[PDB]
Design a protein around this ligand. Structure first.
Ligand SMILES: CCCCCCCCCCCCCCCCCC(=O)OC[C@H](COP(=O)(O)OCCN)OC(=O)CCCCCCCCCCCCCCCCC
Ligand SMILES: NC(=O)C1=CN([C@@H]2O[C@H](COP(=O)(O)OP(=O)(O)OC[C@H]3O[C@@H](n4cnc5c(N)ncnc54)[C@H](OP(=O)(O)O)[C@@H]3O)[C@@H](O)[C@H]2O)C=CC1
Ligand SMILES: [Zn+2]
Lengths: 209, 342, 129, 145, 87, 96, 115
């Protein structure tokens, strides 16, 4: 911890989060697929998508958990996976001053049980995931676009959606209204290749195929 | 073709169409639709204007950056005309008033100016010239407006023999002064019609169709050297036309016959106006003038444009002349006008 | 096991209708599934590990005002990264894009001998170091 | 004159001296009004009431498969055979050799640079030819960085 | 006119299905070319193709005859029908 | 320095000038073409060459940290002057 | 592997029932849309558009994909009924300003390089 430029390591929190991680995996073996703690001390529970409601309810209501606040609910798109979407719940326990992360997965055509029954914060977070990633949440009080324009087609945060989209808007005097046209750019967005051909992080080197 | 005027893109706002057009009289009813269509596909538009710049602002959003250019010009100044055409490949003339002013009369705007534009356009090596005349232009018409159209049409055809001349009927659209003219007669109670409008047949044409025909006339090699007649699909009696307007606007229609000599005197009275006359003696003649049938001339279908029925676009123009009670009435509510079978 | 009470759908996965992509950018686009070639200017090989999917190049033109490169292609800068060829192909199939796959080019193992530079009767002897 | 596309401006098939088939990719589109080479012929055929049965790149490559199946196996060398038969037919005619020496078209490096239309238009190959025939005296340029 | 302009034989180097066509080319092809000196008979091989016999007459018409699992004798008749009878 | 075309348009320091038939020169009608008049190629040539008494000299552009990165110029060739790759100043060895 | 969580419909008969139910709701609503938004189109035009949008997806055979199109169809109906959309959003279905693009080979050949 005396190297001026290097973030010090908190071994005590790593041990506690590791123990609580085994604890959650022992109580809910039916849904928990993986548990891990990072080197900067963040615990992750990876679960089967069926266990969203049981896992989130236990964490909110168990007395040695008490994760009463849903800090965030978001989605990550990984096209290389068959289940391309990674649903992430970030929860805060004010009782124990801890955060935990619960992650699950889905694809384009599979619903994920709406978690509004556990946290009422999730209502808008799920509308956002539906709108930007096209993940359907079953049994939502009202699922509809929240961020995109009315009638907007597509889910912009999918990695295969183009940055500038497919349609642009202008005001057309002939029809006296704002019209939608196919997108053209006077200057195309310039794609830069930045990745260095030399490995940077040996500790993360993947095994050869 | 120079390497700069070769078409590129997909015909959108940022594309290059290859057209470089000088549009005279672009600040009026027909000019805004023309400039809108040229700017949609990516043309370079030179807009010479006589008016205040504030009156050209509706044209600014019509083209991508740099594409709409504005110049000041004076209809009696040939050097101002030359500065505005020397770089263009097509010159479109839409200059005209429906009335006379102290400074510019029908001879000046329909003969002197179009021929000065035609003379300079040829000396400057402009490839295509497009002139807008009138369907009913005639040397023996009792409308000084139409007699000037006839004289200018011949001067244009002699000064620029390859000029494409387009003769439209009376054009309707949101700023037309045609169906808006009739709908504003309600302000005077009844509708004075000569012979009750039973002796006059009109064939109005939709503005967008006139604009589409003009745009094709530029891009079509065959249109060069020809005269076109742009007319609507149907012919109506003036009485049936004006009755249809009042039905679309849901206004009370009380037509009464007024002798020609009297309704002339009404025109003379409104001409005293120092601004824009509500009506003039000439406007009386033109409205009560049977729109000619010119079968020898080609029409819109030749240029590739399908004429739009008056019954599909009248509500668009006339919904603002309704009252709150009738604003929401729909396009199917009113009876279609009776069409003369031709 | 998983007890959601499941259906059986035997059709191939095809999500084109529900992606919002216009028609012209699915039927007419050819994808290229490939491992990028090593940049010859460098010896690092860490950019030749993953599979890529890119789309056919379409017109760019000169902007009349400034001369910038204008495009009407919404997929011109679109590149996707996959771990295997089978992963890259499956993605293109469900999205309805036609694709031409190119098999990975792996450098061959060479026989390097420093002692060969001073051979007694062979041509591998070097005239300089 | 019907302008076409250079090899950098189209996706085209070429077969190398081994018989391997390889396809280019479009890097930039043709300049001006230039069009793809096979599209000009397909467009011309339609104007002449002789329309060809292919309107896309995939269809004109199904046609190449009907004429020679190896032209659509990319990066794959298809071996040939039947050398014995080819020799038998070769002997029948028995033509007579000449007494001219076998002189190759290219003898020195200066004949290498400009050999086709693209390399003849290049100004870099023009400086290459000048350098190997006149020395470095007139090819030098001041270089600082 | 309406006479044969070209023949193409497609066959696999090693597949069992083409075994008939390969035998034909080894034994009878030389005579066939000597019989028809000016007719271009293009024998183009490629791995894993169902063997076929393409014939091209005047003005672009073409016909295709499968040779899958044929025998050298059958291949000879197939060529005879094309050479002799010309559409 | 600034030249003009037969059409009258000024030529910039990059050699750009719309040619006789280009319609794009309409953007200057009623306005002006902005050309910077101090051509850096002309100005850097006016500088006198610096005579130094060593094989290798260093240039940092002047002003210390306000110049360019410091680089060293070899002055062994006596048929030319050493040139800074950043600022274009010229150096020559003084016959030592 | 072919066993997959259902969204709503257990087969294509249950899914097509929801397609017809959604077509009835859109069919009934067009007259009100043309009235409230004050569109110049005819009620016949609006119903021909609804029909057209329903033919684009007529080739589908996956019950889960059909359900999503129905879910998205009902979302668009609510925005129209509650007048969250504006006139500009309704008229985007009719592409009134987009100029017709050629479909044949020669016309497409003259304009540019696109397939
Ligand atoms: C005995 C009978 C005597 C009555 C004779 C009636 C003769 C017919 C005169 C009709 C004049 C129609 C008219 O007023 O239209 C002109 C003008 C239209 O203007 P506007 O629609 O607002 O926008 C366009 C640019 N002014 O007008 C207007 O600006 C609005 C209407 C003005 C009404 C003045 C009263
Ligand atoms: N129903 C119709 O509208 C029909 C029209 N036409 C013809 O179509 C053309 C366009 O008519 P439209 O545009 O509708 O009429 P507008 O009055 O709407 O526009 C006419 C244009 O003429 C310009 N103009 C008039 N007088 C002068 C002048 N002395 N010097 C310079 N510019 C002048 C005006 O410019 P500013 O605004 O600066 O005064 C205006 O931009 C005209 O030639 C007209 O005769 C023919 C048949 C039917
Ligand atoms: Zn320096």
């Amino acid at each position: 911890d005396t190297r001026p430029t290097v973030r010090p390591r908190n071994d005590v929190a790593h041990k506690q989060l590791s123990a609580f991680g085994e604890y959650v995996a022992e109580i809910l073996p039916k849904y928990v697929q993986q548990v891990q703690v990072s080197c900067f001390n963040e615990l992750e529970i990876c679960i089967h998508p069926d266990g969203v409601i049981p896992v989130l309810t236990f964490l909110r209501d168990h007395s040695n958990a008490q994760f009463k606040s849903l800090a965030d609910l978001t989605a990550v798109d990984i096209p290389t996976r068959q289940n391309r979407f990674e649903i992430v719940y970030n929860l805060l326990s004010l009782r124990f001053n801890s955060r935990i992360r619960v992650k699950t997965y889905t694809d384009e055509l599979t619903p994920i049980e709406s978690s509004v029954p556990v946290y009422k914060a999730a209502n808008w977070y799920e509308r956002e995931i539906w709108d930007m990633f096209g993940v359907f949440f079953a049994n939502h009080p009202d699922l509809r676009r929240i961020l995109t324009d009315y009638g907007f087609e597509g889910h912009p945060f999918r990695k295969d959606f183009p940055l500038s989209g497919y349609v642009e808007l202008r005001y057309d005097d002939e029809v006296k209204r704002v019209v939608a046209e196919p997108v053209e750019l006077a200057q195309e967005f310039r794609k830069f290749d930045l990745n260095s051909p030399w490995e940077a992080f040996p500790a993360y080197r993947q095994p050869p195929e | 073709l120079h390497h700069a005027v070769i078409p590129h893109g997909k015909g959108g706002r940022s594309s290059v169409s290859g057209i470089v057009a000088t549009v005279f009289g672009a600040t009026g009813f027909l000019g805004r639709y023309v400039v809108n269509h040229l700017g949609r596909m990516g043309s370079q538009v030179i807009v010479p204007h006589r008016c205040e710049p504030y009156d050209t602002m509706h044209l600014r959003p019509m083209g991508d950056l740099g594409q709409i250019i504005f110049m000041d010009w004076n209809g009696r100044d040939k050097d101002s005309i030359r500065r505005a055409v020397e770089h263009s490949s097509v010159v479109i003339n839409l200059v005209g008033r429906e009335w006379e002013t102290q400074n510019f009369d029908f001879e000046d705007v329909f003969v002197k100016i179009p021929q000065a534009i035609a003379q300079v356009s040829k000396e400057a090596g402009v490839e295509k010239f497009i002139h807008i005349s009138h369907l009913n232009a005639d040397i023996k018409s009792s409308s000084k407006y139409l007699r000037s159209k006839a004289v200018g049409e011949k001067e244009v055809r002699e000064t620029f023999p390859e000029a494409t001349i387009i003769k439209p009927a009376e054009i309707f659209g949101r700023e037309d002064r045609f169906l808006n003219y009739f709908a504003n007669i309600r302000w005077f109670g009844g509708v004075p019609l000569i012979s009750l409008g039973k002796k006059t047949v009109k064939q109005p044409v939709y503005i967008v169709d006139v604009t589409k025909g003009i745009i094709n006339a530029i891009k079509d090699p065959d249109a060069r050297g020809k005269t076109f007649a742009f007319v609507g699909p149907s012919r109506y009696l003036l009485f049936d036309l004006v009755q249809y307007v009042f039905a679309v606007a849901h206004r009370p229609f009380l037509p009464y016959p007024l002798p020609h000599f009297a309704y002339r005197w009404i025109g003379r009275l409104f001409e005293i106006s120092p601004f824009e006359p509500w009506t003039t003696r000439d406007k009386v003649e033109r409205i009560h003038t049977t729109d000619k049938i010119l079968p020898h001339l080609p029409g819109l279908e030749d240029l590739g444009v399908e004429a739009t029925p008056l019954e599909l676009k009248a509500i668009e123009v006339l919904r603002r002349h309704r009252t709150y009670r009738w604003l929401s009435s729909e396009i199917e509510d009113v009876q279609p006008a009776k069409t003369i079978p031709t | 096991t998983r007890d959601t009470q499941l259906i059986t759908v035997d059709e191939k996965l095809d999500i084109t209708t529900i992606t919002g992509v216009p028609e012209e950018h699915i039927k007419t686009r050819k994808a290229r599934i490939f491992v990028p070639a090593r940049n010859n200017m460098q010896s690092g090989v860490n950019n030749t590990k993953k599979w890529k999917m890119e789309f056919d190049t379409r017109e760019r033109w000169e902007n009349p005002l400034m001369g910038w490169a204008s495009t009407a292609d919404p997929l011109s800068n679109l590149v996707l990264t996959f771990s295997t060829k089978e992963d890259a192909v499956a993605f293109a199939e469900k999205n309805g894009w036609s694709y031409d796959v190119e098999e990975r080019k792996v450098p061959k193992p060479k026989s390097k001998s420093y002692g060969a530079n001073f051979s007694w009767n062979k041509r591998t002897r070097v005239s300089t170091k | 004159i019907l302008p076409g596309a250079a090899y950098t401006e189209k996706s085209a098939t070429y077969v190398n001296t081994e018989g391997r088939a390889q396809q280019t990719k479009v890097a930039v589109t043709p300049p001006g009004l230039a069009r793809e080479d096979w599209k000009i012929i397909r467009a011309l055929s339609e104007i002449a009431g002789m329309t060809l049965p292919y309107d896309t790149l995939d269809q004109v490559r199904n046609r190449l498969e009907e004429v020679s199946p190896n032209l659509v196996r990319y990066d794959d060398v298809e071996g040939a055979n039947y050398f014995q038969q080819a020799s038998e037919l070769s002997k029948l005619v028995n033509q007579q050799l000449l007494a001219d020496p076998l002189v190759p078209p290219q003898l020195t490096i200066k004949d290498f640079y400009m050999t086709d239309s693209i390399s003849r238009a290049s100004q870099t190959m023009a400086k290459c030819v000048k350098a190997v025939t006149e020395g470095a005296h007139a090819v030098e340029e001041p270089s600082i960085c | 006119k309406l006479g044969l302009r070209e023949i193409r034989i497609h066959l696999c180097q090693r597949s069992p299905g083409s075994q008939g066509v390969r035998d034909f080319i080894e034994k009878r092809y030389v005579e066939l070319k000597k019989a028809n000196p000016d007719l271009p008979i293009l024998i183009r091989e490629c791995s894993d193709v169902q063997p076929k016999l393409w014939a091209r007459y005047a003005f672009g018409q073409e016909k295709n005859v499968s040779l899958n699992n044929f025998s050298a004798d059958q291949v000879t008749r197939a060529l005879e029908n094309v050479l002799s009878s010309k559409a | 320095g600034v030249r003009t075309s037969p059409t009258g348009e000024k030529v910039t320091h990059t050699g750009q000038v719309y040619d006789d038939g280009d319609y794009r020169k309409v953007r200057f009608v009623g306005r002006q073409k902005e050309v910077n008049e101090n051509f850096a190629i002309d100005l850097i040539a006016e500088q006198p060459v610096s005579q130094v008494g060593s094989r290798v000299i260093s240039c940092d552009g002047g002003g210390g940290a306000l110049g360019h990165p410091r680089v060293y110029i070899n002055l062994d060739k006596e048929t030319k002057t050493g040139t800074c790759g950043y600022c274009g100043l010229q150096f020559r060895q003084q016959h030592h | 592997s072919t066993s997959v969580k259902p969204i709503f419909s257990r087969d294509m008969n249950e899914a097509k029932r929801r397609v017809r139910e959604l077509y009835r709701a859109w069919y009934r609503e067009v007259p009100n849309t043309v009235h409230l938004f004050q569109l110049d189109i005819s009620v016949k035009q609006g119903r021909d558009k609804v029909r057209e949008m329903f033919k684009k997806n007529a080739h589908i055979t996956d019950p889960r994909v059909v359900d999503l199109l129905v879910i998205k169809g009902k979302m668009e109906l609510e925005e129209t009924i509650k007048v969250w959309k504006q006139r500009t959003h309704v008229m985007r279905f009719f592409h009134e300003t987009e100029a017709p693009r050629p479909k044949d080979f020669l016309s497409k050949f003259y304009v540019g390089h696109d397939p």
